[PDB]
Amino acid sequence: PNQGSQTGPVSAHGYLGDSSINDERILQISTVWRCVSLISTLTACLPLDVFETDQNDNRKKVDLSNPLARLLRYSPNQYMTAQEFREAMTMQLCFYGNAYALVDRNSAGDVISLLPLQSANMDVKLVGKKVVYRYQRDSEYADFSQKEIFHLKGFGFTGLVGLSPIAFACKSAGVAVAMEDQQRDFFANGAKSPQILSTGEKVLTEQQRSQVEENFKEIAGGPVKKRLWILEAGFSTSAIGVTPQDAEMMASRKFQVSELARFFGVPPHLVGDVEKSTSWGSGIEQQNLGFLQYTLQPYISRWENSIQRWLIPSKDVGRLHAEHNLDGLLRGDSASRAAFMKAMGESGLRTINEMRRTDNMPPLPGG
Amino acid sequence: PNQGSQTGPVSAHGYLGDSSINDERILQISTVWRCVSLISTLTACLPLDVFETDQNDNRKKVDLSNPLARLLRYSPNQYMTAQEFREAMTMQLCFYGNAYALVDRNSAGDVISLLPLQSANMDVKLVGKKVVYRYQRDSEYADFSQKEIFHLKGFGFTGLVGLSPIAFACKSAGVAVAMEDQQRDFFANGAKSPQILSTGEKVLTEQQRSQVEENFKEIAGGPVKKRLWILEAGFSTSAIGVTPQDAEMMASRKFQVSELARFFGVPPHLVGDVEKSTSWGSGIEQQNLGFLQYTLQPYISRWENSIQRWLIPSKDVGRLHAEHNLDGLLRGDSASRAAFMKAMGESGLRTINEMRRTDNMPPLPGG
Amino acid sequence: PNQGSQTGPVSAHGYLGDSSINDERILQISTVWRCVSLISTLTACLPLDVFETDQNDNRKKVDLSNPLARLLRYSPNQYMTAQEFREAMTMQLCFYGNAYALVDRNSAGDVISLLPLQSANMDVKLVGKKVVYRYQRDSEYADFSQKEIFHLKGFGFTGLVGLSPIAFACKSAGVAVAMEDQQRDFFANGAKSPQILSTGEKVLTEQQRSQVEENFKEIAGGPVKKRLWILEAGFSTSAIGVTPQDAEMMASRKFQVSELARFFGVPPHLVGDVEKSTSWGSGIEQQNLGFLQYTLQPYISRWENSIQRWLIPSKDVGRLHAEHNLDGLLRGDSASRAAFMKAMGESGLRTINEMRRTDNMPPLPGG
Amino acid sequence: PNQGSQTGPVSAHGYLGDSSINDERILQISTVWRCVSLISTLTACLPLDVFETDQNDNRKKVDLSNPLARLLRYSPNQYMTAQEFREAMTMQLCFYGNAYALVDRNSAGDVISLLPLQSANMDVKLVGKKVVYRYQRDSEYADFSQKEIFHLKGFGFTGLVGLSPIAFACKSAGVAVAMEDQQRDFFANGAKSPQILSTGEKVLTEQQRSQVEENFKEIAGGPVKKRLWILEAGFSTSAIGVTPQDAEMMASRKFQVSELARFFGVPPHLVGDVEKSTSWGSGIEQQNLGFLQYTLQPYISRWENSIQRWLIPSKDVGRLHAEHNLDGLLRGDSASRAAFMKAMGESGLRTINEMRRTDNMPPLPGG
């Protein structure tokens, strides 16, 4: 609307008969689980460093004595490590479009803790010319201002809240769930679709017409135990199921793997889909680079920009910024590392000690 | 018309029986979602910098003390970061043809805020020789002059407004929706199309002719639970559905992925379509370069040209411009970077300190 | 004719039963949309510069102080940017064969504005030895001479107006529309072609012969809801539709993608057709070069030559011209750039400062 | 004949039942349109220069002060640019075998204008030992001599007029039109070939035998709306159509694409036929070169030779000639350009300034 709740659909809601569609069931799909896990665990394991630029535009990375460095690297909470906090926030940002944390600042105004909150229990509202965060606890709601909340948004519209990938992926997930349920039911029931007859065309409706189905029912509900009796005439026709043999129920599942991988941006070859890459190619420095350029960079940029805007004071814009170290993801090949160091050292672009530090080895006299 | 609303169709409107077609349902298609998300997130993650050319044509990038740089880099609003604003605007520009923001200038005339507005609630009109923006709020309209709005247009005709990709994609999207709905309904109902008969050719219309369908009805509507009873004569003929087994319902869905990817310019290999690229090729410097040259460059140019025309004063045409930094997208291979630096340094085209800055390293005495 | 309207068919007109053929419907085809969009956006995002040749044949590009450079680079109108104007004109020139703008000159004869007009509302006529442009407004026509009009033409005959690609694409577009409509209707109605019988061969025309079809009617018009009752005899025969399974409704749709791509000249691999290129090849400097040499060059040439003939005075033929900068489309590979600069530097064909300006870097002392 | 009209068939004329064959319908085929457009637009966008050879056989290109240079480069008419005139003449030469323009010379005898004429309204005749050009206007004919006409001929026999490709391609075009019409009709009518019966073998010819077909007729003429009623016996046989499923109606259309591409000389890989080239190969300098050597060179040579013979005075045979600049078509690869310049400069075959001029860059002191 214009003045109410800016959040759209947060959770997936679908019925599809007996098997329903919801957040947990969607996350039980191997593809969705893999996508979300991959993004969150890669993002949170990537070293994050605070830098203090000087008047000359020289960075001079800071150490844990700095409260922001300590908050982001060692202990954002009393409960979890920095990695756990970043994993939780990134995965809320992946599954939903948003991630929320409660900020806690000391009197000076320097942030001293960040407690992650649960998306799907928060509602973003406009009340006048202000944003209110309404968080549902068990019994009573909690209203928060812009300042109390550290908010990582997705790519949604209005620039006020990110669209929910889980809610917009509910129909692809629904068809995937339908196919998986049908396959499970088919292979549970001795691998066939059923058929039953206990009368003809007005044979008898008062004799020998109640228990015969119960002699037949054990294929209607009984997976494999036994029952085998068919009327003399012989119908030999199926009723509810066509054979998997040719209905490409496997090509359909592969295509649905691709369809769901689309909703999160991970390439199909990275989710084990044997779709794009025939064996590993010539990458690891270009495969990783493409993955970063097309999938990860939005999340890294979101983290860094939100940190600078909402966590770093407005006086320390410049002279302080958080940045991810991408060396491990863009590492090398262990034979191109030597070539890179040789090129850098024979051009005067690096000192021996600068390259020795990259490998965590003590300085030499003359580097 | 000649004096009315210049905007054409904005939103998708289709019926297709029960399942209707509209903005949200189309955005629930994995292909459209992935195209829009990729374009918007890539565009907004590009560093955007303000340059101050001098009399000698020397750029000398400006710092955040500059109001335009601070607006485009740090804080366009009190609500969102700069990346969030750019993502929202580029999303409205991808989904529809247009993106609108409410401008706010101080008395001096320097833009001090940009608040994004929602496409799908704005109408562009010609009233006399003037352009009016009519924005639908909850109860009342709001009319805006051309100075109050920052407008990024698509590629439509008349140069006054861009055509809506969502409105022109409504029929391809409709056929995709139809195929997905058909597949879901098939796999929900035990994987078959139904068939029912409870009479013959004028058998009896007053006895045993009301409940027998209800004994049969649970395949017509009842997905899988159970019912299996067929009249003695034996028809065993399908009624509404031909088997998926051979109707290439999977090749149709793949071709529709391609058809919907066409409407947004992203190559099918980048949307996870396993269509063009058989494994990753030799790109990342040439794949990414083609993506930039054929898909992204229009959005970058639109941003830069709109900023210079509408946001930069008319006196500062030259001496100020906004420009995207494409070095992250066109990065390299981490082994070609060393070769490039060696070539530049040994040819006299770069100093050591200039290349060390690229890597964010301190200057050396003699670079 | 010899003296009447030179314009041929401007718009597509077709009936094809219910679904009609017109400009909008053809533009809703993904192929046409992508071809037109690609050409227009690539053409308009191309830097366009005004050069002032001297007596020695030295160009010495001009800046925005020049009225022509300011017109073509910054502000052709009060409504739109130069890129928006060029996109509109190029897209009219792509969809139709012709693009028209109303010129506005000051007393000095120097052009001060160019307002784009709408093709499909203008008719080109000969009246004596003169060309008249008859533009249809809402109620009253407007007649324009040659001087008032900036006209880009296509490749038609008579050299007075370009043929309309949309009109000549009306039949291939009609086949595309027919196939898409058939597929959409097939998948909407539960995936089958219909069949109905409520009598035999002269059975009864006065009893139980009116409602039975209404019982059957829900497969004839009712997409999926339900109805299933078939006469005892048993026909099980289709009536209007053959199965997609083997009629290659997919090969037909792909071939129609190629057929419609032909009408605009864009290669099939550039429109997402997975037809020519097996993954991206070794181009970007040879794929882009082929695209330019076979598709784009006519539009660039038309723009430049029309500007020189019509917008630049007759005295300034030589000493002023407009030229697109193609170094963005023909960029390089980021590793071949260094090789190219090394070759141009060790040959004496370039100074260091000349090659450093290309990258927008300050001059060095000795370049 | 020997004394009448030398022209043979100019236009295509065919009936083929309802859908006729004519110039416009043949040009509505995507293949023919693409071939003609490609040839004409490539030919007319190729720079054309007038050269003034001296006593030593040195060329010394002339500037626009020369009337022939001005006529061919800037303004052949008051209506169109040089590019438009060349496009129109070349496309008349492509579609037909001939292109005609009315010459207009000043008193001195120097050509001052060329007005293109419409092929298909001119007749070439022998009257005595002279050629007469009889041009049909609306009401009266116009007789012209050899001198008043600038005539580009095709490759026909008698050396007096070129054979018409459009008239000799009428049967391949006819079969293409037949296949396209049948496909459009099939997919319009719900995708089937029809069948109707309303009687048996002498059942009744005076009762219930007039409206039953009207109950059936809506598949005979009614594409998809509805009608489904079949006589009890059951014929279930088609009448006019065999299935597309196996009649290779797509292989036939591909072969017809090749057949029509043959009539104009463009390679199938250049018209989007996915026939010869599997992805782009290693050309752009050899692909373009082969295209030029086998397709374009006849048109360039025709233009140049006709200009020299009929436009340049008979005294200025030698000392004046027009020639196309093929640098853009034969451009290079942007990495072989540097190699070519290096080879030319290190052999003494080029001065630095000569190669710098190729790139439009000012002379250096020592080139």
Tab-separated table of N, CA and C in Angstrom, chain A residues 53-149:
chain	number	residue	atom	x	y	z
A	53	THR	N	41.398	4.039	6.235
A	53	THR	CA	42.090	4.852	5.247
A	53	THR	C	42.599	6.143	5.878
A	54	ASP	N	43.763	6.593	5.425
A	54	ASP	CA	44.392	7.799	5.938
A	54	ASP	C	44.200	8.950	4.950
A	55	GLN	N	44.832	10.088	5.241
A	55	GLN	CA	44.706	11.253	4.374
A	55	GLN	C	45.240	10.991	2.972
A	56	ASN	N	46.205	10.082	2.829
A	56	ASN	CA	46.826	9.776	1.548
A	56	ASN	C	46.122	8.651	0.799
A	57	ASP	N	45.001	8.151	1.322
A	57	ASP	CA	44.264	7.037	0.722
A	57	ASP	C	45.034	5.724	0.854
A	58	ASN	N	45.629	5.507	2.026
A	58	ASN	CA	46.345	4.282	2.355
A	58	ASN	C	45.584	3.563	3.461
A	59	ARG	N	45.437	2.243	3.321
A	59	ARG	CA	44.375	1.532	4.029
A	59	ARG	C	44.771	1.187	5.463
A	60	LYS	N	45.856	0.434	5.647
A	60	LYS	CA	46.360	0.136	6.990
A	60	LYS	C	45.300	-0.587	7.829
A	61	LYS	N	45.031	-1.826	7.422
A	61	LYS	CA	44.071	-2.691	8.100
A	61	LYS	C	44.194	-2.597	9.619
A	62	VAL	N	43.044	-2.587	10.298
A	62	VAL	CA	42.991	-2.422	11.744
A	62	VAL	C	42.955	-3.797	12.398
A	63	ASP	N	43.225	-3.822	13.702
A	63	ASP	CA	43.249	-5.054	14.472
A	63	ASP	C	42.052	-5.119	15.419
A	64	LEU	N	41.971	-6.207	16.187
A	64	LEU	CA	40.786	-6.485	16.991
A	64	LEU	C	40.581	-5.487	18.122
A	65	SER	N	41.569	-4.640	18.415
A	65	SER	CA	41.354	-3.582	19.395
A	65	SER	C	40.233	-2.647	18.964
A	66	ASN	N	39.961	-2.576	17.669
A	66	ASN	CA	38.911	-1.703	17.162
A	66	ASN	C	37.546	-2.345	17.400
A	67	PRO	N	36.592	-1.637	18.013
A	67	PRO	CA	35.292	-2.271	18.297
A	67	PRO	C	34.575	-2.823	17.074
A	68	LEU	N	34.638	-2.147	15.926
A	68	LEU	CA	33.964	-2.676	14.743
A	68	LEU	C	34.634	-3.952	14.253
A	69	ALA	N	35.968	-3.978	14.249
A	69	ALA	CA	36.680	-5.191	13.873
A	69	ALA	C	36.341	-6.336	14.815
A	70	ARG	N	36.297	-6.062	16.119
A	70	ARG	CA	35.968	-7.114	17.073
A	70	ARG	C	34.544	-7.609	16.872
A	71	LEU	N	33.613	-6.692	16.619
A	71	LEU	CA	32.221	-7.075	16.415
A	71	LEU	C	32.064	-7.947	15.175
A	72	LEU	N	32.739	-7.585	14.084
A	72	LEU	CA	32.539	-8.291	12.827
A	72	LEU	C	33.384	-9.552	12.698
A	73	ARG	N	34.507	-9.641	13.411
A	73	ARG	CA	35.446	-10.742	13.247
A	73	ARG	C	35.411	-11.768	14.368
A	74	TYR	N	35.162	-11.357	15.611
A	74	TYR	CA	35.324	-12.241	16.758
A	74	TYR	C	34.012	-12.558	17.464
A	75	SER	N	33.259	-11.546	17.892
A	75	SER	CA	32.122	-11.767	18.785
A	75	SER	C	31.064	-10.705	18.554
A	76	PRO	N	30.127	-10.949	17.632
A	76	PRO	CA	28.945	-10.081	17.553
A	76	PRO	C	27.953	-10.326	18.669
A	77	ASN	N	27.981	-11.505	19.284
A	77	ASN	CA	27.046	-11.880	20.328
A	77	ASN	C	27.784	-12.678	21.386
A	78	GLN	N	27.096	-12.914	22.494
A	78	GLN	CA	27.561	-13.854	23.499
A	78	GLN	C	27.223	-15.294	23.145
A	79	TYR	N	26.410	-15.514	22.112
A	79	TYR	CA	25.921	-16.841	21.773
A	79	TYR	C	26.715	-17.524	20.673
A	80	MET	N	27.188	-16.779	19.676
A	80	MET	CA	27.681	-17.383	18.449
A	80	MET	C	28.949	-16.679	17.995
A	81	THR	N	29.700	-17.364	17.136
A	81	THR	CA	30.875	-16.787	16.505
A	81	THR	C	30.451	-15.858	15.371
A	82	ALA	N	31.396	-15.037	14.910
A	82	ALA	CA	31.109	-14.148	13.790
A	82	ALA	C	30.658	-14.937	12.568
A	83	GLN	N	31.256	-16.108	12.348
A	83	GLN	CA	30.861	-16.935	11.217
A	83	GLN	C	29.410	-17.373	11.336
A	84	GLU	N	28.987	-17.784	12.531
A	84	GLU	CA	27.607	-18.221	12.711
A	84	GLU	C	26.630	-17.075	12.485
A	85	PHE	N	26.944	-15.888	13.007
A	85	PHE	CA	26.078	-14.736	12.784
A	85	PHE	C	25.962	-14.411	11.302
A	86	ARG	N	27.091	-14.408	10.589
A	86	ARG	CA	27.048	-14.077	9.170
A	86	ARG	C	26.321	-15.153	8.377
A	87	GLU	N	26.495	-16.423	8.748
A	87	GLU	CA	25.768	-17.498	8.083
A	87	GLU	C	24.268	-17.340	8.273
A	88	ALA	N	23.841	-17.068	9.507
A	88	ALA	CA	22.417	-16.925	9.788
A	88	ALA	C	21.825	-15.744	9.033
A	89	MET	N	22.495	-14.590	9.090
A	89	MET	CA	21.977	-13.414	8.406
A	89	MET	C	21.952	-13.620	6.897
A	90	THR	N	23.023	-14.184	6.332
A	90	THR	CA	23.061	-14.424	4.898
A	90	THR	C	21.997	-15.419	4.471
A	91	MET	N	21.697	-16.416	5.305
A	91	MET	CA	20.731	-17.418	4.881
A	91	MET	C	19.308	-16.893	5.003
A	92	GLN	N	19.036	-16.038	5.989
A	92	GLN	CA	17.762	-15.325	5.992
A	92	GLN	C	17.640	-14.433	4.764
A	93	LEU	N	18.736	-13.777	4.379
A	93	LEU	CA	18.748	-12.952	3.176
A	93	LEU	C	18.558	-13.775	1.905
A	94	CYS	N	18.996	-15.034	1.905
A	94	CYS	CA	18.846	-15.896	0.734
A	94	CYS	C	17.445	-16.491	0.646
A	95	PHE	N	17.007	-17.167	1.710
A	95	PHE	CA	15.695	-17.802	1.709
A	95	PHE	C	14.591	-16.765	1.547
A	96	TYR	N	14.601	-15.736	2.385
A	96	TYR	CA	13.750	-14.572	2.211
A	96	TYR	C	14.531	-13.495	1.463
A	97	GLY	N	13.953	-12.310	1.376
A	97	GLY	CA	14.652	-11.205	0.766
A	97	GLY	C	15.343	-10.302	1.746
A	98	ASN	N	15.220	-10.593	3.037
A	98	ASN	CA	15.627	-9.671	4.077
A	98	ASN	C	16.309	-10.436	5.195
A	99	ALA	N	17.168	-9.724	5.908
A	99	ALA	CA	17.782	-10.215	7.131
A	99	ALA	C	17.795	-9.068	8.123
A	100	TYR	N	17.394	-9.356	9.355
A	100	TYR	CA	17.250	-8.342	10.384
A	100	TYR	C	18.059	-8.740	11.604
A	101	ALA	N	18.734	-7.766	12.200
A	101	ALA	CA	19.397	-7.967	13.478
A	101	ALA	C	19.074	-6.794	14.385
A	102	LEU	N	18.936	-7.069	15.674
A	102	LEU	CA	18.781	-6.017	16.664
A	102	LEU	C	20.148	-5.449	17.014
A	103	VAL	N	20.305	-4.138	16.835
A	103	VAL	CA	21.534	-3.431	17.173
A	103	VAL	C	21.519	-3.109	18.657
A	104	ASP	N	22.700	-3.115	19.272
A	104	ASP	CA	22.871	-2.646	20.641
A	104	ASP	C	24.137	-1.806	20.693
A	105	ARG	N	23.972	-0.521	21.001
A	105	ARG	CA	25.042	0.465	21.037
A	105	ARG	C	25.284	0.916	22.471
A	106	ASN	N	26.540	1.221	22.779
A	106	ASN	CA	26.863	1.823	24.062
A	106	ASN	C	26.521	3.313	24.039
A	107	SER	N	26.786	3.984	25.163
A	107	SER	CA	26.428	5.395	25.275
A	107	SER	C	27.113	6.227	24.197
A	108	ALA	N	28.384	5.935	23.916
A	108	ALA	CA	29.113	6.677	22.894
A	108	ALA	C	28.459	6.574	21.522
A	109	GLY	N	27.684	5.520	21.273
A	109	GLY	CA	27.097	5.280	19.973
A	109	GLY	C	27.804	4.231	19.144
A	110	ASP	N	28.828	3.578	19.688
A	110	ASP	CA	29.525	2.522	18.969
A	110	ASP	C	28.803	1.197	19.181
A	111	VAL	N	28.499	0.506	18.082
A	111	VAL	CA	27.731	-0.731	18.159
A	111	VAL	C	28.522	-1.764	18.948
A	112	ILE	N	27.880	-2.369	19.946
A	112	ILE	CA	28.521	-3.397	20.757
A	112	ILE	C	27.860	-4.761	20.631
A	113	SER	N	26.707	-4.880	19.978
A	113	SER	CA	26.216	-6.223	19.679
A	113	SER	C	25.189	-6.179	18.557
A	114	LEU	N	25.041	-7.326	17.890
A	114	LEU	CA	24.045	-7.533	16.839
A	114	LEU	C	23.404	-8.895	17.065
A	115	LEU	N	22.108	-8.912	17.387
A	115	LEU	CA	21.393	-10.157	17.644
A	115	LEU	C	20.508	-10.498	16.456
A	116	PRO	N	20.785	-11.554	15.691
A	116	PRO	CA	19.940	-11.840	14.524
A	116	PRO	C	18.496	-12.101	14.926
A	117	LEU	N	17.575	-11.641	14.087
A	117	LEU	CA	16.151	-11.876	14.265
A	117	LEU	C	15.659	-12.835	13.193
A	118	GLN	N	14.437	-13.318	13.371
A	118	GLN	CA	13.859	-14.307	12.470
A	118	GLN	C	12.968	-13.600	11.458
A	119	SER	N	13.404	-13.566	10.201
A	119	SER	CA	12.518	-13.183	9.112
A	119	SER	C	11.305	-14.098	9.146
A	120	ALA	N	10.211	-13.690	8.515
A	120	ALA	CA	8.911	-14.349	8.551
A	120	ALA	C	8.165	-14.048	9.841
A	121	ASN	N	8.783	-13.366	10.805
A	121	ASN	CA	8.084	-12.847	11.975
A	121	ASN	C	8.245	-11.338	12.099
A	122	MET	N	8.757	-10.675	11.064
A	122	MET	CA	8.854	-9.224	11.056
A	122	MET	C	8.040	-8.653	9.906
A	123	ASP	N	7.518	-7.454	10.133
A	123	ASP	CA	6.683	-6.731	9.191
A	123	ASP	C	7.210	-5.307	9.093
A	124	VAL	N	7.532	-4.871	7.879
A	124	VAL	CA	8.059	-3.533	7.638
A	124	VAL	C	6.899	-2.627	7.256
A	125	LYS	N	6.758	-1.504	7.958
A	125	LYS	CA	5.620	-0.617	7.773
A	125	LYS	C	6.098	0.816	7.606
A	126	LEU	N	5.309	1.599	6.878
A	126	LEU	CA	5.460	3.046	6.840
A	126	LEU	C	4.402	3.654	7.751
A	127	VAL	N	4.842	4.453	8.715
A	127	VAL	CA	3.952	5.157	9.631
A	127	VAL	C	4.380	6.616	9.585
A	128	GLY	N	3.615	7.441	8.874
A	128	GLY	CA	4.111	8.764	8.566
A	128	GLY	C	5.323	8.662	7.656
A	129	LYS	N	6.265	9.578	7.843
A	129	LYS	CA	7.526	9.526	7.106
A	129	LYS	C	8.591	8.772	7.895
A	130	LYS	N	8.251	7.560	8.331
A	130	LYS	CA	9.176	6.741	9.096
A	130	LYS	C	8.883	5.277	8.820
A	131	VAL	N	9.905	4.447	8.996
A	131	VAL	CA	9.790	3.001	8.865
A	131	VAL	C	9.750	2.398	10.258
A	132	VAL	N	8.802	1.496	10.472
A	132	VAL	CA	8.647	0.779	11.728
A	132	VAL	C	8.815	-0.703	11.443
A	133	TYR	N	9.566	-1.379	12.299
A	133	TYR	CA	9.772	-2.818	12.202
A	133	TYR	C	8.935	-3.464	13.299
A	134	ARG	N	7.902	-4.197	12.900
A	134	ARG	CA	7.007	-4.860	13.835
A	134	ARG	C	7.365	-6.340	13.894
A	135	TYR	N	7.949	-6.768	15.005
A	135	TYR	CA	8.439	-8.129	15.164
A	135	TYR	C	7.503	-8.890	16.088
A	136	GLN	N	7.032	-10.041	15.622
A	136	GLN	CA	6.115	-10.881	16.379
A	136	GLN	C	6.910	-11.808	17.291
A	137	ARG	N	6.782	-11.616	18.601
A	137	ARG	CA	7.197	-12.631	19.554
A	137	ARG	C	6.019	-13.570	19.801
A	138	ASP	N	6.113	-14.397	20.842
A	138	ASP	CA	5.040	-15.339	21.142
A	138	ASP	C	3.700	-14.628	21.275
A	139	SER	N	3.591	-13.717	22.239
A	139	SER	CA	2.317	-13.116	22.607
A	139	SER	C	2.184	-11.663	22.178
A	140	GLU	N	3.248	-10.877	22.297
A	140	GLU	CA	3.173	-9.434	22.132
A	140	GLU	C	4.109	-8.967	21.023
A	141	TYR	N	3.662	-7.967	20.268
A	141	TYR	CA	4.460	-7.396	19.195
A	141	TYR	C	5.524	-6.454	19.751
A	142	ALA	N	6.543	-6.202	18.933
A	142	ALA	CA	7.641	-5.318	19.307
A	142	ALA	C	7.865	-4.332	18.174
A	143	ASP	N	7.762	-3.045	18.474
A	143	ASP	CA	7.987	-2.012	17.478
A	143	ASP	C	9.402	-1.467	17.610
A	144	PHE	N	10.107	-1.411	16.485
A	144	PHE	CA	11.480	-0.939	16.439
A	144	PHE	C	11.593	0.160	15.396
A	145	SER	N	12.558	1.047	15.609
A	145	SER	CA	12.823	2.137	14.687
A	145	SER	C	13.865	1.701	13.659
A	146	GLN	N	14.255	2.627	12.780
A	146	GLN	CA	15.287	2.311	11.800
A	146	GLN	C	16.625	2.046	12.474
A	147	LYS	N	16.916	2.763	13.559
A	147	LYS	CA	18.255	2.714	14.132
A	147	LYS	C	18.505	1.417	14.889
A	148	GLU	N	17.483	0.873	15.545
A	148	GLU	CA	17.657	-0.332	16.341
A	148	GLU	C	17.906	-1.574	15.498
A	149	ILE	N	17.751	-1.489	14.179
A	149	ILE	CA	17.745	-2.656	13.305
A	149	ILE	C	18.868	-2.518	12.288
